[PDB]
């Protein structure tokens, strides 16, 4: 239907998803020439991130990433409208080239990238309806690099073996999703862009935190090697690797920063 | 009517040119994880590059770049067949952002890039026929950085006001094409890839020289302001700027280097 490789990879998405060839596409390279400090960019507030340890949240392998469903009482405060959470998921490379973030900074990929997807619940009833509408979506992006073991990311990664194949689903006990955010969340890049996968709707307000998080080499290896993008009984299995989009052209536009220094 | 910007830009080329969505696409980012030294990459020799100043060669704006036609007696010695020259041309950015190379190195763009296109003349009678056969083409790529004025490049650039519009033709006296190549041509990157424009045929043996050449800011500004993709009489003119493709996924390819450090 769509993939990140072969005949149905990214250069072919615009045949069935015309917005993939339209305006405002993400991701982009965040580089100094196009950065502009904007003192209007104040800190976001993450509300309802501390998920009940008494509730369970659905983890799925959807054949393109691993996604955790989030509840709509979790939201971002600080934007014009409230944006309520719908899901999180990740993008990564492969062990021979372990640099699979979607955004780059001064031309450099990070190892991986987490996206916490929210929709404008003041204007729209659910994420599906908001997804192709004005001001519809807001995604937070965390850049990931190898470093220290990260116990919070392991609250997700410990479940990967239960969602190895496309279609499979596991339950994850609530935990504080703010633990997956980096230091100094007040420091971020902000621009108007798009979903980085089909349908590529140009309806995303991006917030990419300035500082990366760390995960260990073993945790990064697990994320790169645990999943397949095929069904369990597919006689031709494919490993889920390199599930990021290449950077798009971004011309005569700025990315605004909440930091100058 | 494919372009580098807008609805007919590069995410849409695969709608009309299926090889643009196929394998083995160029350009690519040259970075350490995918480099491997190959001691079998011996030096090329450039034969018949010193074109007579008393002869003249056709310069044409083809709607996508500016190209200089080259004579078939100009050839590369050192591949497994003789490859004869057919044309050279360039890719570049724009006046406010002079960063328009096609290949990148460790995620950074150079100002511009020169391609000297050759075809297997042992097997094929012309470059068009060669272009759709396996390793039918060999392209040399020179990375261009903003630096000193370069009198040799100016033997092309001094004619740009005479090929401003699509289809226009000018004559350039012969000069020594080897003066467009960088220092230490024995140091290069080699990989199997494709044309970087439609029809994106995967039939190119690429050689990217390790070292860049320099042209001045004034020479880049001339190149970036002289030319149009449209005909002289077109009521909707379009500036020929940013005529480079984004880098492509490396579909399990390595890039081989003739230098080990
Ligand atoms: C509400 C849209 C659901 S589909 C979807 C597709 C891609 C993204 S991304 N990678 O965060 O831009 C997020 C969501
Ligand atoms: C012989 C093929 C002529 S068309 C052509 C199209 C693209 C290239 S490129 N930019 O050198 O890959 C070179 C030639
Ligand atoms: Zn994503
Ligand atoms: Zn070219």
XYZ file of C-alpha atoms and ligand atoms in Angstrom:
552
model
C 0.000 0.000 0.000
C 2.873 2.241 1.100
C 6.317 1.438 2.441
C 9.705 3.037 2.988
C 11.554 0.979 0.373
C 11.204 -0.559 -3.105
C 8.454 0.432 -5.597
C 6.053 1.648 -2.989
C 8.565 3.847 -1.095
C 8.504 7.545 -0.536
C 9.034 8.872 -4.033
C 5.841 6.913 -5.018
C 3.557 8.067 -2.143
C 2.165 11.050 -4.096
C 0.482 8.712 -6.645
C -2.147 7.579 -4.144
C -1.645 10.409 -1.547
C -1.451 13.621 -3.486
C -0.593 15.745 -0.427
C 2.789 13.930 -0.311
C 3.694 16.074 -3.342
C 2.140 19.239 -2.042
C 3.096 22.160 0.152
C 4.416 22.293 3.689
C 6.025 18.775 3.717
C 8.001 17.463 6.674
C 10.495 16.511 7.896
C 13.158 19.195 7.265
C 16.740 20.001 8.111
C 16.915 22.440 10.989
C 19.945 24.582 10.212
C 21.225 27.866 11.349
C 20.451 29.993 8.242
C 16.721 29.378 8.583
C 16.404 29.651 12.381
C 14.767 32.721 13.923
C 14.293 33.349 17.608
C 10.724 34.230 18.473
C 10.190 35.498 22.080
C 6.457 34.588 21.619
C 7.359 30.889 21.986
C 6.641 30.219 25.656
C 6.878 26.855 27.444
C 4.220 24.235 26.747
C 2.497 22.498 29.662
C 2.023 18.756 29.493
C -1.226 17.913 31.266
C -2.523 14.498 31.973
C 0.819 12.937 30.873
C 1.071 10.964 34.153
C -1.040 8.054 32.941
C -2.841 6.018 35.561
C -0.721 2.926 36.437
C -4.217 1.336 36.856
C -5.139 1.797 33.192
C -3.673 -0.120 30.190
C -2.830 1.441 26.825
C -2.869 -0.359 23.518
C 0.519 -0.891 21.751
C 0.296 -1.896 18.145
C 2.678 -2.722 15.288
C 0.871 -1.081 12.400
C 3.375 -2.269 9.761
C 5.065 1.185 9.682
C 6.105 1.811 13.325
C 5.201 0.778 16.816
C 2.413 2.967 18.189
C 1.022 3.484 21.705
C -2.568 4.743 21.903
C -2.968 7.658 24.304
C -6.099 8.997 26.080
C -7.763 12.204 25.086
C -7.562 13.728 28.582
C -3.769 13.983 28.017
C -3.120 17.308 26.327
C -0.834 20.215 25.592
C -1.633 23.556 27.131
C 0.002 26.726 25.825
C -1.064 26.697 22.144
C -4.087 28.669 20.997
C -6.337 25.721 21.143
C -6.048 22.673 23.321
C -4.424 19.766 21.587
C -5.287 16.324 23.013
C -3.078 13.299 22.657
C -3.954 10.431 20.337
C -0.802 8.247 19.962
C 2.929 8.081 20.105
C 5.328 6.240 17.876
C 8.962 6.108 16.743
C 11.218 6.229 13.623
C 14.649 4.711 13.363
C 17.401 3.495 11.014
C 19.211 0.110 11.121
C 22.200 -1.358 12.862
C 24.559 -0.735 9.885
C 23.477 2.894 9.697
C 21.880 3.761 13.085
C 20.799 7.332 12.165
C 17.195 7.278 11.491
C 15.636 10.411 12.909
C 13.310 12.243 10.558
C 14.360 15.819 11.365
C 18.055 16.617 11.058
C 20.005 19.392 12.764
C 22.730 21.110 10.648
C 22.461 18.186 8.259
C 22.881 15.486 10.929
C 20.498 12.685 11.795
C 20.010 11.512 15.301
C 19.653 7.787 15.964
C 15.878 7.847 16.252
C 12.899 10.110 16.825
C 9.764 9.891 19.048
C 6.511 11.593 17.900
C 3.708 12.323 20.359
C 0.714 13.109 18.122
C -2.087 15.459 19.316
C -5.200 16.881 17.647
C -7.154 20.140 18.089
C -9.950 18.916 20.324
C -11.409 22.460 20.777
C -12.238 22.512 17.012
C -12.625 18.792 16.156
C -14.094 15.697 17.747
C -11.303 13.201 17.176
C -7.898 12.857 15.545
C -9.212 11.276 12.358
C -11.575 14.211 11.667
C -8.865 16.794 12.631
C -6.155 15.214 10.524
C -7.018 16.956 7.213
C -8.242 20.217 8.679
C -6.910 23.614 9.411
C -4.962 23.752 12.659
C -5.796 20.123 13.028
C -2.671 18.467 14.517
C 0.298 19.194 16.749
C 3.196 16.710 17.079
C 5.990 16.855 19.620
C 9.303 15.389 18.425
C 12.061 14.133 20.649
C 15.466 13.411 19.094
C 17.111 10.204 20.405
C 20.846 9.438 20.604
C 22.792 6.515 22.013
C 24.051 7.092 25.583
C 22.840 5.951 28.964
C 20.231 3.271 29.546
C 16.852 4.975 29.788
C 14.393 3.267 32.158
C 11.460 5.334 30.919
C 11.859 4.382 27.286
C 12.150 0.786 28.459
C 8.538 1.038 29.680
C 7.780 0.914 25.996
C 10.712 -1.133 24.656
C 10.084 -4.042 27.130
C 6.864 -4.740 25.237
C 8.343 -4.828 21.744
C 8.632 -8.622 21.578
C 4.850 -8.893 21.963
C 4.257 -6.683 18.888
C 6.857 -8.237 16.581
C 4.588 -8.616 13.479
C 2.154 -6.350 11.697
C -1.266 -6.434 13.405
C -0.089 -7.596 16.798
C -1.135 -5.677 19.934
C -0.019 -5.572 23.625
C -1.087 -3.659 26.681
C 1.159 -1.219 28.376
C 0.386 -0.033 32.001
C 0.138 3.677 32.290
C 3.310 5.603 33.089
C 4.387 9.290 33.074
C 4.855 10.075 29.352
C 6.658 13.311 30.366
C 9.577 11.005 31.347
C 10.182 10.523 27.579
C 10.812 14.235 27.077
C 14.278 15.735 27.144
C 15.818 18.285 29.415
C 14.786 21.925 29.088
C 11.580 21.374 27.163
C 11.245 25.183 27.099
C 13.953 25.014 24.301
C 12.392 24.003 20.963
C 12.026 24.529 17.214
C 8.605 25.316 15.875
C 7.261 25.330 12.275
C 4.154 24.512 10.272
C 4.440 21.259 8.358
C 2.906 17.977 7.549
C 2.436 14.319 8.563
C 5.679 12.562 7.551
C 3.813 9.584 6.313
C 0.857 9.189 4.004
C -1.522 10.878 3.722
C 1.084 13.712 4.374
C -1.623 16.227 5.261
C -0.112 19.735 5.711
C -1.925 20.264 8.992
C 0.836 19.784 11.643
C 2.204 22.284 14.044
C 5.651 20.810 14.766
C 7.507 21.266 18.026
C 10.979 19.631 17.900
C 12.760 19.832 21.247
C 16.247 21.299 21.079
C 17.881 18.612 23.348
C 17.980 14.936 22.595
C 17.336 12.073 25.035
C 19.595 9.033 25.437
C 18.977 5.365 25.204
C 21.518 2.649 25.513
C 23.178 0.870 22.652
C 21.264 -2.241 23.544
C 17.922 -0.381 23.692
C 18.595 1.211 20.256
C 19.560 -2.229 18.860
C 16.347 -3.739 20.208
C 14.193 -1.037 18.618
C 16.020 -1.599 15.271
C 15.802 -5.379 15.334
C 12.574 -6.304 17.247
C 9.910 -5.620 14.601
C 8.773 -6.693 11.212
C 6.592 -4.770 8.862
C 5.001 -8.003 7.658
C 2.264 -10.291 9.130
C 3.458 -13.303 11.201
C 2.522 -15.796 8.503
C 3.968 -13.878 5.554
C 6.280 -16.359 3.830
C 8.529 -13.388 2.896
C 9.202 -11.452 6.074
C 10.672 -7.931 6.068
C 12.406 -6.326 9.028
C 11.017 -2.908 10.090
C 14.035 -0.677 9.619
C 14.755 2.764 8.044
C 11.161 3.891 8.660
C 11.873 7.623 8.300
C 11.164 9.994 5.428
C 13.995 11.899 3.749
C 14.151 15.622 4.484
C 12.045 17.850 2.199
C 12.949 21.081 0.485
C 12.130 24.104 2.717
C 12.662 27.409 0.906
C 11.904 31.024 1.739
C 10.673 29.794 5.175
C 11.860 30.048 8.735
C 11.874 27.696 11.639
C 11.228 29.625 14.804
C 13.166 28.879 17.974
C 12.223 29.501 21.609
C 15.915 29.942 22.421
C 18.416 32.315 20.942
C 21.680 31.401 22.725
C 6.957 19.959 -17.490
C 8.595 18.246 -14.477
C 10.235 20.861 -12.276
C 12.154 21.129 -8.972
C 9.405 23.060 -7.119
C 5.655 22.883 -6.736
C 3.167 20.308 -7.912
C 5.418 18.993 -10.631
C 8.482 18.789 -8.293
C 10.489 15.833 -7.302
C 7.985 13.960 -5.043
C 5.752 13.798 -8.152
C 8.216 12.706 -10.799
C 7.425 9.045 -10.263
C 3.812 9.690 -11.461
C 5.156 10.088 -15.063
C 8.672 8.529 -14.768
C 8.436 5.237 -12.951
C 12.207 4.763 -12.529
C 12.205 7.879 -10.248
C 10.413 5.625 -7.691
C 12.610 2.632 -8.371
C 15.820 1.400 -6.958
C 19.354 2.690 -7.215
C 18.469 6.402 -7.127
C 20.857 9.306 -6.927
C 22.067 11.565 -5.408
C 23.061 10.304 -1.986
C 24.649 11.561 1.217
C 28.268 10.399 1.444
C 28.843 9.571 5.117
C 31.108 7.203 7.025
C 28.657 4.355 7.755
C 28.234 3.507 4.173
C 31.836 4.135 2.890
C 34.260 1.281 2.223
C 37.790 1.609 0.848
C 38.350 -0.420 -2.319
C 42.020 -0.692 -3.417
C 40.766 -1.768 -6.902
C 39.663 1.848 -7.569
C 42.647 2.908 -9.631
C 43.053 6.377 -11.160
C 41.068 7.507 -14.135
C 42.764 9.155 -17.058
C 41.115 12.036 -18.898
C 41.781 11.829 -22.653
C 40.921 14.516 -25.194
C 39.716 16.917 -22.493
C 41.844 19.741 -23.812
C 39.401 20.987 -26.434
C 40.825 23.310 -29.094
C 40.247 27.102 -28.454
C 39.766 27.357 -32.175
C 36.772 25.018 -32.177
C 33.422 25.807 -30.600
C 30.968 23.781 -28.589
C 27.248 24.197 -28.195
C 25.891 25.533 -24.891
C 22.119 25.034 -24.448
C 19.515 25.834 -21.780
C 17.500 22.671 -21.726
C 14.812 23.962 -19.367
C 16.430 22.224 -16.325
C 20.121 23.210 -16.358
C 22.617 24.696 -18.682
C 24.517 22.080 -20.728
C 27.663 22.184 -22.881
C 27.838 19.454 -25.601
C 31.118 17.596 -25.654
C 32.792 15.694 -28.479
C 32.938 11.858 -28.501
C 36.738 11.864 -28.903
C 36.877 13.140 -25.229
C 36.929 10.060 -23.027
C 37.731 8.447 -19.703
C 40.391 5.712 -19.686
C 40.439 3.312 -16.720
C 36.918 1.924 -16.542
C 36.193 -1.492 -17.934
C 34.988 0.041 -21.244
C 35.939 3.353 -22.794
C 33.303 5.978 -21.825
C 33.066 8.926 -24.161
C 31.876 12.414 -23.222
C 28.433 13.646 -24.280
C 27.755 16.799 -22.214
C 28.393 18.612 -18.931
C 25.979 20.659 -16.864
C 25.457 22.033 -13.375
C 23.119 22.124 -10.346
C 22.858 25.018 -7.938
C 20.811 26.816 -5.316
C 19.689 30.435 -5.310
C 20.988 33.880 -4.517
C 19.868 33.934 -0.907
C 20.864 30.315 -0.233
C 23.875 29.180 -2.335
C 23.736 25.510 -1.256
C 22.571 23.517 -4.232
C 24.885 20.512 -4.746
C 23.125 17.200 -5.357
C 25.477 14.935 -3.410
C 26.107 15.879 0.205
C 29.010 14.974 2.385
C 28.346 14.063 6.023
C 24.982 15.835 5.623
C 26.271 19.177 4.174
C 25.534 20.657 0.794
C 28.121 22.294 -1.270
C 27.341 25.478 -3.239
C 26.888 23.732 -6.593
C 27.850 20.628 -8.529
C 29.245 19.920 -12.012
C 28.349 16.700 -13.843
C 30.352 15.501 -16.838
C 28.259 12.834 -18.505
C 29.885 9.970 -20.482
C 28.443 6.906 -22.202
C 29.841 3.458 -23.018
C 30.926 4.115 -26.633
C 32.458 0.592 -26.928
C 28.875 -0.845 -26.749
C 26.585 1.944 -27.816
C 26.508 4.460 -30.604
C 25.209 7.432 -28.602
C 24.379 8.427 -25.032
C 20.578 8.227 -25.456
C 20.817 4.542 -26.435
C 23.339 3.887 -23.622
C 21.109 5.650 -21.063
C 18.778 2.821 -20.592
C 21.381 -0.033 -20.443
C 23.053 -1.388 -17.355
C 26.180 0.768 -16.605
C 25.569 2.517 -19.989
C 26.571 5.910 -18.411
C 29.489 7.135 -16.267
C 29.072 10.563 -14.710
C 31.886 12.532 -13.022
C 30.750 14.827 -10.268
C 32.726 17.803 -8.978
C 31.557 19.463 -5.756
C 31.759 23.234 -5.946
C 32.248 25.510 -2.930
C 32.146 29.284 -2.641
C 35.742 30.516 -2.744
C 38.115 32.095 -5.249
C 37.181 33.270 -8.692
C 37.710 30.435 -11.095
C 38.731 31.541 -14.658
C 38.128 28.039 -16.042
C 34.464 27.894 -14.879
C 34.074 31.399 -16.179
C 34.728 30.090 -19.748
C 31.144 28.644 -19.286
C 29.603 31.303 -17.059
C 30.567 34.236 -19.225
C 28.022 32.934 -21.826
C 25.014 32.592 -19.442
C 23.328 35.792 -20.561
C 23.071 34.235 -24.047
C 21.229 31.045 -23.078
C 18.831 32.704 -20.606
C 15.753 30.884 -21.822
C 14.705 27.327 -22.545
C 15.906 26.143 -25.897
C 18.392 28.935 -26.535
C 21.895 27.929 -27.846
C 25.288 29.717 -27.758
C 28.808 28.676 -28.811
C 31.615 28.391 -26.324
C 35.247 28.228 -27.604
C 37.049 25.007 -26.539
C 39.068 25.020 -23.383
C 40.705 22.381 -21.256
C 37.879 20.629 -19.424
C 40.346 19.072 -17.069
C 40.719 22.602 -15.553
C 37.177 22.092 -14.115
C 38.358 19.038 -12.065
C 39.700 19.364 -8.497
C 43.024 18.438 -6.960
C 43.920 14.793 -6.534
C 41.466 13.282 -8.880
C 42.749 9.906 -7.844
C 40.702 10.299 -4.645
C 37.018 9.640 -5.365
C 33.811 7.983 -4.291
C 32.322 5.382 -6.599
C 28.803 3.898 -6.527
C 26.017 2.543 -8.730
C 23.137 4.918 -9.120
C 20.893 6.790 -11.503
C 20.201 9.881 -13.455
C 19.275 12.576 -10.911
C 16.476 13.945 -13.174
C 13.678 12.224 -15.013
C 13.758 9.633 -16.460
C 15.874 8.637 -13.447
C 17.307 5.613 -15.255
C 19.357 3.418 -12.802
C 22.175 3.140 -15.314
C 24.905 5.377 -13.977
C 28.286 4.536 -12.631
C 28.992 7.615 -10.407
C 32.431 9.014 -9.552
C 32.320 11.869 -7.105
C 35.753 13.465 -6.559
C 36.736 13.825 -2.913
C 37.969 17.374 -3.166
C 35.813 20.364 -4.206
C 36.701 23.190 -6.492
C 35.992 26.853 -5.768
C 34.090 29.518 -7.688
C 33.356 32.994 -6.346
C 30.232 34.405 -4.813
C 29.864 36.614 -7.931
C 30.140 33.593 -10.233
C 27.491 31.697 -8.166
C 25.230 34.799 -8.226
C 25.587 34.995 -12.033
C 24.719 31.319 -12.381
C 21.781 31.663 -9.966
C 20.257 34.744 -11.695
C 20.937 34.352 -15.372
C 18.656 31.470 -16.394
C 14.983 30.549 -16.731
C 13.322 27.122 -17.164
C 10.789 28.746 -19.512
C 10.870 30.027 -23.062
C 11.676 33.664 -23.843
C 8.004 34.372 -24.683
C 6.444 32.568 -21.780
C 3.910 34.800 -19.919
C 4.609 32.875 -16.609
C 8.450 32.854 -16.388
C 10.162 30.611 -13.899
C 13.742 31.220 -12.574
C 16.137 28.266 -12.890
C 17.125 27.962 -9.264
C 17.374 25.126 -6.760
C 17.728 22.635 -9.567
C 18.994 19.754 -7.407
C 17.256 16.608 -6.164
C 17.104 15.696 -2.448
C 19.340 12.797 -1.423
C 17.855 9.326 -1.726
C 17.672 6.344 0.581
C 20.611 3.988 0.127
C 18.626 0.768 -0.574
C 21.517 -1.375 1.055
C 24.166 0.130 -1.295
C 27.716 0.993 -0.123
C 29.882 3.687 -1.625
C 33.453 2.625 -2.422
C 36.319 4.976 -1.938
C 39.736 5.080 -3.681
C 41.185 6.666 -0.455
C 41.330 4.919 2.832
C 41.614 7.965 5.085
C -4.012 11.736 13.233
C -3.107 11.285 12.102
C -2.841 9.804 12.224
S -1.693 9.210 10.916
C -0.103 9.909 11.350
C 0.841 9.793 10.322
C 2.105 10.337 10.629
C 2.362 11.057 11.782
S 3.923 11.783 12.049
N 5.088 10.763 11.662
O 3.981 12.099 13.514
O 3.946 12.968 11.179
C 1.388 11.104 12.768
C 0.103 10.564 12.562
C 22.362 10.575 -21.670
C 21.275 10.930 -20.652
C 20.947 12.401 -20.930
S 19.692 12.956 -19.710
C 20.627 13.204 -18.183
C 19.789 13.403 -17.154
C 20.407 13.536 -15.905
C 21.833 13.471 -15.756
S 22.681 13.638 -14.206
N 22.172 14.992 -13.479
O 24.048 13.838 -14.532
O 22.353 12.428 -13.490
C 22.599 13.298 -16.935
C 21.952 13.095 -18.191
Zn 6.150 10.101 13.138
Zn 23.351 16.424 -13.242
